[PDB]
Amino acid sequence: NNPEYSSFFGVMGASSAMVFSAMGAAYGTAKSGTGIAAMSVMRPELIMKSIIPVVMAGIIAIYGLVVAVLIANSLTDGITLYRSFLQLGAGLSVGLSGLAAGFAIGIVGDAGVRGTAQQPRLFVGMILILIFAEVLGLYGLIVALILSTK
Amino acid sequence: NNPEYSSFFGVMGASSAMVFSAMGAAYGTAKSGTGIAAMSVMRPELIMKSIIPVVMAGIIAIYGLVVAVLIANSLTDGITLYRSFLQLGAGLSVGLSGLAAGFAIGIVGDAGVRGTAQQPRLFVGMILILIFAEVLGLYGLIVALILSTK
Amino acid sequence: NNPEYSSFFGVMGASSAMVFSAMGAAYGTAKSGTGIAAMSVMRPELIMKSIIPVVMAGIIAIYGLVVAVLIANSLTDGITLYRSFLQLGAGLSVGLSGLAAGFAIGIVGDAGVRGTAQQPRLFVGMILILIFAEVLGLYGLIVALILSTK
Amino acid sequence: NNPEYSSFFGVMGASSAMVFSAMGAAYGTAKSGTGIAAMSVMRPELIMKSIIPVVMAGIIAIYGLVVAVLIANSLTDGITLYRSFLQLGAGLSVGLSGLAAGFAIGIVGDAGVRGTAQQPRLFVGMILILIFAEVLGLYGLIVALILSTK
Amino acid sequence: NNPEYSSFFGVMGASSAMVFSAMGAAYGTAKSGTGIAAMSVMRPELIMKSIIPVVMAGIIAIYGLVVAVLIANSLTDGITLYRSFLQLGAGLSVGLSGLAAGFAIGIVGDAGVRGTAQQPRLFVGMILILIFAEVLGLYGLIVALILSTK
Amino acid sequence: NNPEYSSFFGVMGASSAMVFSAMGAAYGTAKSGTGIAAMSVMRPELIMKSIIPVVMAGIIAIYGLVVAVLIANSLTDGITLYRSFLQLGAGLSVGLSGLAAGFAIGIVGDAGVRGTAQQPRLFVGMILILIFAEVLGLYGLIVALILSTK
Amino acid sequence: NNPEYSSFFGVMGASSAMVFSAMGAAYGTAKSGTGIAAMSVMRPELIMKSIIPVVMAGIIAIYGLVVAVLIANSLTDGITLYRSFLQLGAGLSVGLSGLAAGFAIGIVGDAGVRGTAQQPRLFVGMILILIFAEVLGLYGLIVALILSTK
Amino acid sequence: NNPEYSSFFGVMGASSAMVFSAMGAAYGTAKSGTGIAAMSVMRPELIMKSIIPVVMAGIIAIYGLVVAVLIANSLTDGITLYRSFLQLGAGLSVGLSGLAAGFAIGIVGDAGVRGTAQQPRLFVGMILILIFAEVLGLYGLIVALILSTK
Amino acid sequence: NNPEYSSFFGVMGASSAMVFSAMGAAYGTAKSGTGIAAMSVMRPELIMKSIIPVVMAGIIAIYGLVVAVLIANSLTDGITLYRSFLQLGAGLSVGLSGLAAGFAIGIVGDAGVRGTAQQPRLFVGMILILIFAEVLGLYGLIVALILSTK
Amino acid sequence: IHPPVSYNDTAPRILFWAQNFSVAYKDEWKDLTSLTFGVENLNLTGSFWNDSFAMLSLTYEPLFGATVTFKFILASRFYPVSARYWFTMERLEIHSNGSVAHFNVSQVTGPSIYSFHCEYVSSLSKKGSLLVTNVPSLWQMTLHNFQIQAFNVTGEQFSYASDCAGFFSPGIWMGLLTTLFMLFIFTYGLHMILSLKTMDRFDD
Amino acid sequence: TGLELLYLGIFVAFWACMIVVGICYTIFDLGFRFDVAWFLTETSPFMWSNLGIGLAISLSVVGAAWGIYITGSSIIGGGVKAPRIKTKNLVSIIFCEAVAIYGIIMAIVISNMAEPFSATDPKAIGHRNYHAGYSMFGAGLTVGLSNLFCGVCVGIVGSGAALADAQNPSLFVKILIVEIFGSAIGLFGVIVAILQTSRVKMG
Amino acid sequence: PYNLAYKYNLEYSVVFNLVLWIMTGLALAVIITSYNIWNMDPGYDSIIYRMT
């Protein structure tokens, strides 16, 4: 029969998927918000357009939530150790990829908002770079989904 | 079987849910309070409005308290190991997500408060960014509840 | 029946409840002491009025003492390993929560008293922020009581 | 018979293949994004050309995703320990090679963008350097394909 | 009957009490001595009064000594492992709580004597903050007594 | 006979042969790219001639790739622990040797190109020094080929 | 019927009682020596008065020596594991207490002699602080003697 | 007879003998290359003379190569643990000696390459210090040969 | 008869006695010697007097050598485990005590020689402080002889 | 779960359990699990239990045409380095028709107050080879999940279980320490190489 | 503090794990598993002996090269303005290299002590062989680390002496005594290594 | 029943060390890479001096 401690790795997959995605989103929001705060003192009207980096950072927390809820609803008492490993792998693959995407979003958003304060034309390029930064968390989600549903 | 030590992981879930959420709130209150003190030297009328970040930092700790109380009520001497792991997962998911939310709130509150000292229009932008940051703690709470009541 | 190492976690819960809470209160009192002394050079009349952060730091050590005495009194020879884990969890929940609350109280006390030296309007705001930092240790105490009595 | 713990190395192979490629792409996107933002203050015309470093960084994340998908698709519960180790090797070889490639892309992209603002002649050499820094991800991908499909 | 390694935790209780209380008292004395040496240059008549922080730092070592002697007297060849755990808990409580008290007393006394060089009215506030920082060692002693005589 | 876990060292040999070679080459490309960007502002004509350090940083990755491909094509299922160790040894001897060669290439390329901006006669000396730094990767390749084909 | 490895702990008792007291006394002599020299470049007549902290640091090493000789004389091949634990406890409680007293004496002596050059009145205050620091090593000695002569 | 894993230590001998020698030679080449690049801009005609420390770093690498090749050819399948550990000893003997000798060559070569530009008489002095810095790697090679041919 | 591994701790006693005493002597000689050399250009006639700290540092190496020779002479292959521990204790109690004495001697020699170069009358005070610092090595030697000859 | 074999001398003295107990003679593998566990007619005659020496003499009548006997021989004694009576299975001894074949048992040891468990106490190299012979022999044996306790036995229960499966083994220890020395050397070298620097300026 | 954070984190995590593991083993009565005897006995004597030789030479070279660059940097720098330095202050280099010479001599001497066993049961390996292994390891550590510290010390003093010579030629012959006193530590390490391996015979 | 021992597999040393050291390596790699990204030079120093 399957081992008793098997559910541990699945539960850690869920908690990791949520925790590291939350850390990535927190860092992204922190840096982007600092950028917006510095930008505002000079260019007030850009404040709302410049919240977009915060939103793209929050996407990463939403991705972590998706994987965490999916794993949590997939957990069972008799979970085979193989499924527990799949869930742990998916959880980390989304959580740490989201952490990296949060780093990218935070740094790019801070620098890009500060720049867009000084030169409005940057906004489009900043959005493109933020998209390239967020698609990393998206790829992490894809890997997590393939692992988990497998 | 249900080994004799099984409740250890549930107790650690409760302890984590409270401790890590409290540290998130403590940081989100320390940074925010330093920012408020630095701002108030010149804008004494903004203190009450600028206390909001402290309130959301406290909300993080309240999420932690909710999940910690839930785990501590779900604990039992014969708690099966699978349930104990679920509770540990909930504890970490709320605690460390609240810690990330607290860091985000602290940084955002400090920067935005020092900004709204100099540009009042930044206040509502701060409010939006802070709600985004606190929604990270809320996601942590959601996953924690799902795990604990799974 | 009960393993004879069961009381180790009880004694470590008591020792954590006191040690970590006292470290938090000590840091709070140290930072508040530096802040108070620095302010008092120019604003001596505020010396006594500005003792509040120290008091709200000592309250954290009082929470630690209450929980530690509870555990120490509730710790018999044949303590069930599950109950010993409960007491360890209570000790950590109060101790590290008091550590977080003490860090927040210390930083806020330093900032708030230094500001009050300059802007008298900041005293009520500082007290509000200190109350928010203190309720974290209070949450820790509540969770610790739930675990200990459970 | 094959050990139940065999799949752990495969799931870590997939998770690593994605996580480290994501970290490399995140560094490459972040530093190149700060470079683009700093450049755009003076030379807005160059944003859409200077975006190329970010595309190079993203291709590393795509390499990571492809290898992670191969591994995840090839996972099973009875996966023989030999195939599990092969998949861990593929995951590391592409993940950390992409990590190094993304770090090189970030550094050279930032330097090349900032230099191209000053000296347009630098663009072609920047393209060559980015290609040399990026084919490291391709070598990692080749090794990972061999190990994973072996 | 009772394990032979039982006495190890008791002797660590005693040595921990003394060592950590002595380290707290030593840190407090060192910081207060540096403060007194800096202050005395301009205000020689304050050297004798400014030794109060040193006295309250030494009282922490006295707490540690009392708990250490209690544990040392309680040690005997066949003490139950439970009693040894109690003595370890008392030692850690008194010693590390006194260490925190010594840290607080050191910083408070240094800052307070340096301030009292300038604003004589700071002395009463310094004494009160020292009392608050010192009752942490007293809480450690109370918990240590409750554990050690149980 | 040929324990089940024997392939692990060979697979790690392949992973090292690629990863550490890639990191050496990535550092070389990054450092030499920064040097070339700095040099190209004032001496545009030198950029295409000065890409040699980047080429020699890339060649380290070809060494790593060759050894990694040879190891990957020399991995049967029941590989003897002796051959698995040989392939780990080849992987390290080429990967870490390439890492050292990459550090040498990076430092020498940065210094040499930024100097050749000032003094044209330094170019041939830089090429010789880069050859001496490069043949370290070649010595690693030689040892790795001997070990891996043994 | 006792373990042959029992005497290891008593040997470490003596070894700590000497090593840590020697380290504390070395620090107390070193800091005090730098202070005495830097003072003597200007006020040579204070050398012999200011040598006091060095002597009080040396008394810490004498405490360590007395305890180490006592433990060494107490060692035997058949020493019970209980007595060996007593002697390790005594060794630590004298050695590390002397280490703390040595740090305190060193810092206090350095600062005190430096000040006593500037303010002759500070001499008695310095001596009192140094007596308080020395009494910590004395408490370590008392605990060590109690334990080692149980 | 001999344990299955006996070849690991000889393999590590070979890989270390190459890797550490490569790292020493790389450090030597990098430091000497920085020195030569700095020297060339002011005194171009000394480049080819000043390239000597790089030659000696290459010689260190060759010592490593010789020992590594010897061990690799000595590694048979049934290698006794005694021969395997002899070869590990030789691997460290050449690798770490070559590492230190390479560091010394790098530093003295940098200093002497710079010095020769300001004071040409120092050329022979630099060479004479360098041959002493390299006979250390030669010593390591001697001991490695003796060990690996014992 | 005695265990196989017993002589290990005696061997390490000898190795510690020499390694740590060599560390202390080397540091004392190096620190005092750089002090002496830097002094000598200002005051060439003081060198033969300033050598005294170097001799005091050498005496630490002599203590280490004496204890190490005693251990190595008494240490037979099959000594009792109790004697092996005694010799390890003597080795540490001379080696690390002599290390502390070496640090004290180095710091005091550097400071005192530099001061004496500026103020001749500091010489005798420096001699006294050096005696107090070097006597720690003598205490280590006494404990080491007692343990090793017991 | 079939019950353990319990050699009784006024009380359970020797407890012996194995999930799958198989033997082979000239490669004719046979299974003795059913013939051993749960059969009330098992022939343990010739077994012996000193206070410091034990011998479990299992016997099977028709097997391989002769009444074969397997004597598991263990001892327990006071190891002065620690106050504990440690027990070791000295050997295993197979009596065929007119001859005896000896297997030494390499790693079966533990505190006498605890039982000893080990997956695959078997003579096959594929399965740990805890049983061993220096002289080539006709017999082979495998005891999947072999658990035994011959001293300080309490009723029908095995005491707590020591076992061979540990966190570390001698080979892994040698490898880890060699790798730790190499990692110190590499970290020193990498610290020096990383702390390299390049000039930020050049002369005129 | 970048790399030192990694070092400190590894150190602190390792020792926290060791404290927790020791407490757990002791408390759970599992102390009988923590067989330091089994470790020291099964870990082959060859490992200890060859680590001893390798370190005996390699740490001595890490000392010699370290001192050589410490003192060579100063020799060259001071020689830029005072070229007379180069010929005279080479004695510091000679003293640093004598340390590596001690290293090779003792490494060869120790390697002369290793012999094969053809025995693998610890009772058959025996006290003599285990002692040979540990004593060669001890000699290796003794000579290697004593020489490392001695070379570093002599390098520091030689740098000081070269800088002093840069400004007063007569100064060198008197500062050289400090280098001699430093150098004596390597000889002491060699003596202790010889005595450690005085009665060693593998076989 | 019978207090039978937990059935630890004989390969426990190998699997334990593989897991422990592979995971330590991966964790250290993640921590170091994330530290480098976290303390990455933010690059907007060309903007800072106006904002400060």
DSSP secondary structure, A9-54, as one string: HHHHHHHHHHHHHHHHHHHHHHHHHHHHHHHHTT-GGGTTGGGHHH
Domain ranges of chain L: 1-52
List of chains touching A (3+ CB pairs within 8 A): B, D, L
Return the structure tokens found at J159: 């005491």
Q: Any idea what DSSP says for residue J64?
A: G
| Cβ pair B18, B93 in contact under 8 A | no
> Facing residues of B16 across strands?
none
How far apart (Å, rounded) are the C-alpha atoms in residues K202 and K130?
8
CB nearest J202 (choices: H20, H30, H41)? H41
Radius of gyration of chain H (CA): 18
Q: How far is L52 from chain D (nearest CA, A)?
A: 17
Sign, Cα dihedral of F129, F132, F138, F143: negative
Q: How far is K84 from chain C (nearest CA, A)?
A: 58
Q: Any idea what DSSP says for residue J43?
A: B
Determine how many CB atoms are found less than 10 A away from the CB of residue K118: 9
- The answer to whether residue K145 neighbours chain I at the CB level (below 8 Å) is yes
Nearest residue on chain G to I121, alpha-carbon basis: G44
Return the structure tokens found at C30: 């140290």
* Cα dihedral value K10, K14, K20, K22, nearest 10: -170
How far apart (Å, rounded) are the C-alpha atoms in residues H16 and B138?
52
How far apart (Å, rounded) are the C-alpha atoms in residues K141 and K118?
27
The number of angstroms, rounded, from the C-alpha of D110 to the middle of its chain's C-alpha atoms is 17
Strand pairing category for J12-17 and J20-25: unpaired
Largest CA distance in chain D: 66
Strand pairing category for J115-118 and J161-163: parallel
Buried b (16+ CB within 10 A) or exposed e, K50-73: bbbbbbbbbbbbbbbbbbbbbbbb
Taking Cα atoms as reference points, which of K196, K129, C103 lies closest to residue B30? C103
Largest CA distance in chain J: 103
| Cβ pair E28, G107 in contact under 8 A | no
Taking Cα atoms as reference points, which of E125, E106, E144, E116 lies closest to residue E14? E144
| Cβ pair H122, K76 in contact under 8 A | yes
| Cβ pair I115, I126 in contact under 8 A | yes
Nearest residue on chain E to K25, alpha-carbon basis: E5
- J85's enclosing H/E stretch is strand J85-96
Q: How far is F122 from chain L (nearest CA, A)?
A: 32
Determine how many CB atoms are found less than 10 A away from the CB of residue F149: 11
Pairs from L23-31 (Cβ < 8 Å, separation ≥ 24): L23/D12, L26/D12, L26/D16, L28/K6, L29/D20, L29/D96, L29/D99, L30/A96, L30/D19, L30/D20, L30/D23
**What residue type is A74 in one-letter code?**
S
Determine how many CB atoms are found less than 10 A away from the CB of residue F53: 31
Determine how many CB atoms are found less than 10 A away from the CB of residue I74: 17
> Facing residues of J161 across strands?
J115
Interface contact I65-K188, CB threshold 8 A: yes
Helices (H), D41-121: 47-50, 52-74, 81-118
* Cα dihedral value J182, J184, J187, J192, nearest 10: -110
How far apart (Å, rounded) are the C-alpha atoms in residues E86 and E89?
5
Testing the interface with J: which of K32, K49, K120, K123 to mutate, by most J Cβ within 10 A? K32
Q: Which residues of L touch D99 (CB under 8 A)?
A: 29, 33
How far apart (Å, rounded) are the C-alpha atoms in residues J112 and E49?
67
Q: How far is E21 from chain K (nearest CA, A)?
A: 21
Tell me how far CA of residue A67 lies from CA of A95, A137, A140, A148, L23, in angstroms: 9, 12, 10, 9, 22
Strand-by-strand arrangement of the J146-149 sheet: J5-8, J12-17, J146-149, J115-118, J161-163
Residue E145: what are its φ and ψ, rounded to 5°? -65, -45
How far apart (Å, rounded) are the C-alpha atoms in residues A36 and A50?
6
Interface contact D23-A114, CB threshold 8 A: no
How far apart (Å, rounded) are the C-alpha atoms in residues H143 and H93?
7
Per the document, the length of chain J is 204
Q: Any idea what DSSP says for residue F119?
A: -
Q: Which residues of D touch F69 (CB under 8 A)?
A: 142-143, 146
Q: How far is G124 from chain E (nearest CA, A)?
A: 9
| Cβ pair K200, K132 in contact under 8 A | yes
Q: Which residues of K touch C6 (CB under 8 A)?
A: none
How far apart (Å, rounded) are the C-alpha atoms in residues K78 and F128?
30
**What residue type is F114 in one-letter code?**
R
Interface contact K42-J82, CB threshold 8 A: no
Strand pairing category for J20-25 and J28-31: antiparallel
Write the DSSP assignment of D106-146 as a string of letters: HHHHHHHHHHHHH-TTHHHHHHHHHHHHHHHHHHHHHHHHH
- The answer to whether residue K160 neighbours chain H at the CB level (below 8 Å) is no
Residue I52: what are its φ and ψ, rounded to 5°? -55, -45
Interface contact I26-K153, CB threshold 8 A: yes
| Cβ pair E91, E15 in contact under 8 A | yes
Question: What's this structure's resolution in Å?
Answer: 3.6
Nearest residue on chain I to K67, alpha-carbon basis: I30
Chain pair B-C, CB pairs under 8 angstroms: 153
How far apart (Å, rounded) are the C-alpha atoms in residues G108 and G112?
6
| Cβ pair H141, H67 in contact under 8 A | yes
How far apart (Å, rounded) are the C-alpha atoms in residues J120 and G27?
59
Interface contact C11-E104, CB threshold 8 A: no
Determine how many CB atoms are found less than 10 A away from the CB of residue D3: 18
Q: Which residues of C touch E86 (CB under 8 A)?
A: 7, 11, 75
| Cβ pair B87, B11 in contact under 8 A | no
Interface contact J193-H92, CB threshold 8 A: no
How far apart (Å, rounded) are the C-alpha atoms in residues D86 and D64?
16
Q: How far is C87 from chain B (nearest CA, A)?
A: 9
Q: Which residues of L touch D16 (CB under 8 A)?
A: 26
Write the DSSP assignment of J144-203 as a string of letters: ETEEEE-SS-BTTB--SEEES--S--HHHHHHHHHHHHHHHHHHHHHHHHHT----S---
SS3 J141: strand
* Cα dihedral value J58, J64, J65, J68, nearest 10: -20
Determine how many CB atoms are found less than 10 A away from the CB of residue A150: 15
**Distance between terminal CA atoms of chain J?**
89
Interface contact A121-D40, CB threshold 8 A: yes
- Helices and strands, counts by H and E, chain L: 2, 0
Buried b (16+ CB within 10 A) or exposed e, D34-50: bbbbbbbbebbebbeeb
Tell me how far CA of residue J52 lies from CA of B140, J48, J73, J79, J157, in angstroms: 60, 11, 11, 13, 20
List of chains touching C (3+ CB pairs within 8 A): B, E, K
Interface contact F111-J125, CB threshold 8 A: no
| Cβ pair E39, E50 in contact under 8 A | yes
Return the structure tokens found at E119: 């604003």
* Burial class (CB within 10 angstroms; exposed 0-12, middle 13-18, buried 19+) of A147: buried
Radius of gyration of chain G (CA): 18
CB nearest A12 (choices: B89, B128, B137)? B89
How far apart (Å, rounded) are the C-alpha atoms in residues E20 and I46?
45
Residue C6: what are its φ and ψ, rounded to 5°? -70, -30
For F2: left if phi > 0, alpha if psi spans -120 to 50, otherwise beta; the answer is left
Tell me how far CA of residue E137 lies from CA of C58, E141, H48, in angstroms: 12, 6, 71
Interface contact L47-A110, CB threshold 8 A: no
Residues 6 or more apart whose Cβ sits within 8 Å of residue H22: F96, F97, F100, F101, F136, F137, F139, F140, H61, H64
How far apart (Å, rounded) are the C-alpha atoms in residues D99 and D137?
8
Sign, Cα dihedral of C95, C100, C101, C105: positive
Nearest residue on chain H to J182, alpha-carbon basis: H16
Residues of A with CB under 8 A from a CB of D: 3, 80-82, 85-86, 88-90, 92-93, 96-97, 100-101, 103-104, 107-108, 111-112, 114-115, 118-119, 121-122, 124-126, 128-129, 132-133, 135-137, 139-140, 142-143, 146-147, 150
SS3 K83: coil
Determine how many CB atoms are found less than 10 A away from the CB of residue L50: 12
| Cβ pair C95, C13 in contact under 8 A | no
Residues 6 or more apart whose Cβ sits within 8 Å of residue I114: G37, I35, I38, I39
Testing the interface with J: which of K42, K70, K118, K148 to mutate, by most J Cβ within 10 A? K42
The number of angstroms, rounded, from the C-alpha of I97 to the middle of its chain's C-alpha atoms is 7
How far apart (Å, rounded) are the C-alpha atoms in residues G7 and I82?
6
Taking Cα atoms as reference points, which of B56, B65, B66, B52 lies closest to residue B134? B56
Interface contact I37-K128, CB threshold 8 A: no
